[model samples]
Target: SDFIQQGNQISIDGKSYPVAWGQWQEGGQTRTGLGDTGAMQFLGLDLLDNTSPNQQPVQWFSGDRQTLNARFVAPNRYLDVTSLLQGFGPLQAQGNTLVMPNTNAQILTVRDGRQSWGERVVLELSQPAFWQVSQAREEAVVTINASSQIRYRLERSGASSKVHFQLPVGYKLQVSTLTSPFRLVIDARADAPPVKTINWTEGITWQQRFVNISGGQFPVTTVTINPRSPGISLRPLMANPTMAQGTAPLVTIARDQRAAVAINAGFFNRNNQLPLGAVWSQQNWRSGPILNRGAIAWNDQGQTTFGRLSLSEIITTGSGQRLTANYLNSGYVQRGIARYTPAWGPSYIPLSDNEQVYVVQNSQVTAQYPLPKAGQQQMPIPSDGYLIIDRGNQIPAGVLAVGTTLNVNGRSTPEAFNAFPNGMGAGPLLIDQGRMVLNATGEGFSSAFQQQRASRSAIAVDRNGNIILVASHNRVGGAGASLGEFAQILQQLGAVNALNLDGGSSTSLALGGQLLDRSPVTAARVSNAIGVFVR
Candidate 1:
């Protein structure tokens, strides 16, 4: 494919010459000569003759007509001019020598002329000739100033180039030419290598610690100092030593007495307060001036009555016949003795049939309700059964009588009967009698009655029937000390094995009299008295 040329057709010396083509054939004809053959033309080749072998190379000149010139000697084609002078004109050849003019007459000089024959003066007529030549056969030549040598030097100039500087505070600045939009990148990193130094200082000195540079206003972010380990430990501020004392002694009795009785350490008695339960031991035994004398009574097995004692009295009832009181209507009852029988050993009984008859020295009498097997007894006598003493009642059929005596004594007449070393008045001696009775009266009767009211007291008779007593107290009042009161009361009640029951307002007893334990408030009557009775 041939390219269509669009530029102006070149002319030399006012003549539109044909362009040169190299080694091209068209339409089965080898067209030659400086004439157009419809498409393009090829001019015949010429050679220049060299006459000097020792002289410098001939300086070939290109005609001022914008044509390229070459020296061709057979197969060798070379340029001979250092620089060609520019112009436009016709070229004239005369016997191995040629002259080209500017616009058919202007002569442009080609220097260092040397003559050579057999060398060709090849003229390339611009575009058509250059385009027709094979690019692979074209040779390139480079020219250097052969008379000069190169050297480099460092110099300073005030050009607008970016300059990088490192401050004493471990910061860096980069400088470069700002031919375009300008920006600065500072590698604030600590690990960058030091920049080369050109000034008097051989190296940059970086500050080792962070310092306050301004008047506490400007903060420095680039420089930092290593923190040191703290020497003192941080702790909470010391607090004032807390001042405290042991808890106030718990006034247990005072608290209880305040709640229940409203009386503080005041003595009490039976005639005023009534009594509940039995006189078990020395702890609950009434023995003060408030206890009444001549207030006790006794009986023989035949029902023959014996003498009675006033308040402050003490009496010994027959074996198997112990004194007890009744708790009725949630109130107090008379304290008396019922005949003890082998079958009446549990805490209580609720049925009349469960009551037993106690006869003095009457072991021969078989028990109506036989004693329970060794481990069968229930605790805290049920409020059902009663104990009875026939005293001198005639012996039953097939039962022999055990003879016994009954006597009564009083505290005021301590010598009136045998007195015990523990100051317990004695009388109503029961050699072999069935039952006895002791009533509360006089000023001390309330305290004696309280002995019966408290649940912790007990009375125990040894196998020999020698009585022993025990009691407990709670540092003066009758409140939280109910258990302690119980201990004292059971001791007064002659209980070998006794326990406390509900007390305080619930302390009550009933007998052959008006209700003894009455509520200070509601006066409603109640039944079911806990007392000693015979079946």
Candidate 2:
């Protein structure tokens, strides 16, 4: 077809059609586009004319007329707005749409109430978003920030308050986010729930049932045991008790430990087959803690505690200089020095990135070796000493010369778990003292990990003080629970405190030499587990 261009008219096959800004003839139909809100105008092809000395680049603005940075390319018919507006949360250039980047996020509902706990306001959200809160003597305001998904029905100019409330009394405000059906909560912090002591009982109980949560029914297997019950103890179930030793099916580990019941626990790396979180068992730490995630500790004395765990290690050189270590026998690789012992295996190997290894024997630096690259060089672990892997060259060269004396000291958070001979650290605490205190991101878990459904396992303490081991199977027609639904299921099971274990394929529940959850094809072998021993 022959084409011709004239004033607001283009001729194709001698058929002339008029075109205007945001308006064009397509297939003999009038099509309306972005209107006047687009990044640039269709004022001829001079939009990107740099040759014209008097030409000016089009200026884009928000609905409220706030200028946004943009580079318009008339040839590509698109805008390079990668850094357009920082205050709009995030920015994107969609055809004919001038809204925030996250189009699916919305402000669903606003709930205001005065309960026995305190005066509160709740904003139901379609998805998670960054938010902040401010309190005045007689009023309070909450401003949801940008960079999250688009928020709807929230009328505002600039970065202003999205939700505002009047306070009748002076009270400190507390702001937090709740999952499942995600929402933002603002509390007056007055008349809040007080802390209560739980008197846990000693016993063992088993049950398998189909429970309803989040509008779905799931088959859940549970083994409730009192860590203090006679002949009953909670121990870290591992194949060799070494960080890089090996892994086994949950049932096999249970059978070897002679445990009546067991469930998978903690996260691990598959390539090198190393434990990621803290694993304290048999009065020693076989693996170090990371990210201060959720953990549980118990002993034969009926003492059990659940909380976030942290390990602080300080290495004092002969010159009285103190150095800190980031991790101990951990698979979570990062900058800084990581301490390793015989529990880390017979040999030491760099996990990743740049690494320098130092050998300390009898409190003296004996040897030093720098790897050609990560995951290559290997050194033997001295049975009488330990190895420190310094990543990213955090330590200066010759800082610890041969024959230099050093003192390494360490301690755990809560300090209470240190007294317990056995401990295992995992993820996003499910419940705390009968409340839904699931903060996955705060606990160093990814949002996808918390929101995605998978085969699930968790260790918890019920109201009666009995320990509960739970595993939700992925049936043919039904999937497992997300972190939110997992929390709800624990709450339904009467859990007062709970910690989520390594789920997905690592979700296993074994009892009486048989697996009660899914098939081994789906719930595969695990690096470690929490075993239940009953005499």
Candidate 3:
């Protein structure tokens, strides 16, 4: 081997010496300052020390700049140098050359020159130690060249290659190869004594294993080993379990009464239509307005009847300010009107001059209809109406009225629609309406009609007729029950007429001064929200 020698001599701790590299070889077991190893031996000396133990190995200091100490120990001997500085520093190994940097300049120093045997060497760092350095610096700090360190004696058998390395008795060997990158594997059994395994890049796939003392708790003399595989490939482990086991629990809010709520569909009179003419024109396909009025009456003959009130006609138009003012000027009610403005204006607006139009401005409405008697009252509504508004928008200046009570829930937070729609335009109110008409595919509806919306949260209606919403991160979509799944979950929690509102990321339910959902829709900006407060 070629040796590089430095002609300039530097003094270290009052000792002067030249820098040079040399190679040594032995045929069999050779003993140096530390112990004996087969074929090759290494020795470390502190040239600055003039002590009696002249053959002792050099000591290392912990610091930022690489430095050497005068203390020395024989090979294969362990020392407790942790108290010398804050902690251990970086040690780089390349082929037969090893380089170490002193971390704490206040504690340790490196000496210049050769004293008795040769130059000084640092300890070998474990893989974890190397990783720690990278993590701290956010970059790779050390590199190891194993090919130049120890020459392994290799013997090839039928399909398998075996190699050996001279190592300490207690040090276990970890094998790694180039094909497998940074993969490491132990070469010892669970019940075997600690033995260092030689790392060889034999061009074969390698596995990782662990080694430890076999059986006895204390005073153990044997070593045991175990192997574990990777828990996940490249995919996120959290999403896997959620997908396999379904989403988290949903929130459900119950009705204000014990009456059963049903969806009803029927033809009503239009505000500007002729008398006796169907408000909803089949050809024109116009929507009309009918009074939800009050509760229906139950009959003893197993029949239910509904009371009729005033009929009003709605006019659909392309005016933007009128649409906005209509929703804004309309006196807030527990139940309000909602409409979807298509991107290309109102497609069905020209179909009818007296179309019952309900526009949803920057707010949402929650419409409540009295429940029908089980066998006596009519089957609620036919699950069809102009629209069932959800009073959950967080828009400021928006109207909110619960019976005789009226107040503004405030504007919604920007995070109200963090998961879907990717903006604040969609919130609880929009989600509520979206949940109802997600299947209605037509020209005048919002683009949400084209997308199947699912709830990431759950809803709950308490015994007090108050609705409690809970936000979740679970996904819901495609060929499954509607938000009805939330109703079922609510049933289990003692709710009778529970319903699921708009969910996804917008499914936020803040209660008890804290948000129940893990991922809050909004960061910190408080906006409009429909909440249940004790009257």
Candidate 4:
């Protein structure tokens, strides 16, 4: 074993090692720090506090520069961690060997133990104390703060390994503690929890399980509803049932609707509180589908459907001119014309500037208004009519003047799904026939959005024909599942078909008027949700 001695310079094996000195503030005290730059690199103590890749060299510090003059020689090169230990208390120098006379514990060994599911790295200390564990994508760093006289090895297998132990691919570190010699254990298990059922109501059952992915044990809650039960059905809910206007929290929506279960269902603009996707309820379309995204549709008789939805609306003028409309009552503003019916609300407001409004009543264009700027006035939606909003100059002024008698016709693709009479559109099909088909980019979702690990919600149907609503929240220090991991979770829950819903802040779930998922922050208000009724 090579010995290390620290002074103005670090020395190992009777050879000089280069060291640099600097000053930094810690605990309201100015501390003098030393950095190893030469070969041996402070006797390989660099692994003690190197938390991230491409990190600056690890530095050790004391309260003052004079205290650093105390020389320390240790057989185990990593024992001389002055930065963390120096803050503990004073050290006594005896014959060039600085030792902590009051040091309470000693590290026994660091070992890697293999398991049937995965591998684990274990550390045993003589006394019960906290060991700092910092994790990266592929490494778990355990900084042991003790002066152990016994010989120990930190390396797991290879000499060229960047970390003390190389984690298996797709494996992450899960730190835990055990008593009886105070063991610190880091596990890398691809674990799935057993299904434990909780009967919430006669027709609704709930299950809470931890889905281990990326080192975090994300809590996932799934609600299984027996749609075939008598007097039980699912319906699409909106923030404002009478009008498409404001947003409300899921708890509020559930309470108002007196629902057995409620979960966020569709995407919407957070800024303006307008639906961004299809929102159909009670045989009326409140909002139309955009971007041909995934949607789940259901009927009164326990029939449910899932697929990408395409909504088409064409406008025909009295003069025999035909034009296609982009959307219906959607908040998504782009270079196109969007039609808004009284089903959206009694009034229509331009989502953006350079917009024109054409009001049609009884198939006659009764009024036409062009706005050079937005928010100047609100266009009234006749009880028997709808409003056509042309943005980005898609419809020229005077093209469809007042009394033009324009007619709007609509249709939804995959006729069977749209025929359900109740639906909510969201994004990116997660699974089909128990297989992961996560093509977020193909479904108009950005690559960055697809890989995000945040609060997530989904609706699926199990092989037994039960409807499943799932929600996963971000824990305090843990993350929710990514899209790919979420797909796996759905598959494990027996989902034959699954669709991702409005997630992130809008990801919410409620049962019996109680918010179930533990959101990292305050629960977010959503524009629309799906309600389960047992009446």
My TM-score estimates for the predictions, one after another, are: 0.14, 0.61, 0.21, 0.62
Q: On residues 177-275, what C-alpha lDDT tens digit does candidate 3 reach at each position?
A: 111122212232112222222111111011111111121111111101110111100011110121111122111110111101101111111231111
lDDT of 3 at 300: 19
lDDT of 1 by residue, 1-535 (tens): 1211111122323333223212213465321112111011111111122222111122122122222233221111222211232233223333222322332211121112112211111111111110111001011111110111111111222211111122222222111111111111122222222222111001101111121211111111110101111121101000011100011101122121111101111112223232221221112222221222221111112111122222332223444332322121111212332332222233332222232343332223223332233324433322232223222222243232234332233343333322221222112121112222333332234554444423112122322332222222212112223333333333333333222222333222211111112211212111111111111
Ten residues in sequence with the least summed lDDT for candidate 4: 69-78
Question: Which 10 consecutive residues of model 2 have the lowest summed lDDT?
Answer: 37-46
Best by lDDT: 4
Top-down lDDT ranking? 4, 2, 3, 1
Candidate 3 ranges beyond 4 A from true positions: 1-453, 456-467, 475-481, 521-527, 532-535
lDDT of each: 0.21, 0.64, 0.22, 0.66
Kindly state the number of residue pairs that clash in model 2.
4
Better of 1 and 3 by TM-score: 3
Who is ahead in lDDT, 2 or 4?
Answer: 4
lDDT of 4 at 310: 81
lDDT per residue for candidate 4 within 1-535, as digits (tens), equals 1222333333222333223223333467544333322211322222222322123233222122221221111100112234445544743333332333233545577677678767776767665332333333345454444434111236332211112445544454445556555665667654422234544445566677776554456668888998887778888888886777779998778767766688998888888898888888777888888888988888878888888898888888878888889788888888888898998888887778878877888988888777667676788889998888888778765678887877777778888865788898998889877778888887899878976887789999998889999997653245667888777777877899999998887887876555656421357898989998876
User: What is the Cα-based TM-score of model 4?
Assistant: 0.62
For model 1, the run of ten residues with the poorest summed lDDT? 236-245
Candidate 2 lDDT by residue in tens digits, 1-535: 1111102222212232222112333467433222111222111111221222122233222122222222111101122233332333533222333333332345677777776656667777765454444444345556663212111234453432356556544244556556566666777643211111111122544466666776476667777777666667778877665455578888667656656567999898876678889898877888888998999998887677889999989999999988899799888888888999988888887777568889999889999887757677688988989998888888877789999999989888988877878899998787988899888888888867867888788999887787888887543244568788889988988999999999988888865444555434345678898877655
Q: List all candidate RMSDs to the true structure.
A: 60.6, 23.4, 28.0, 19.0
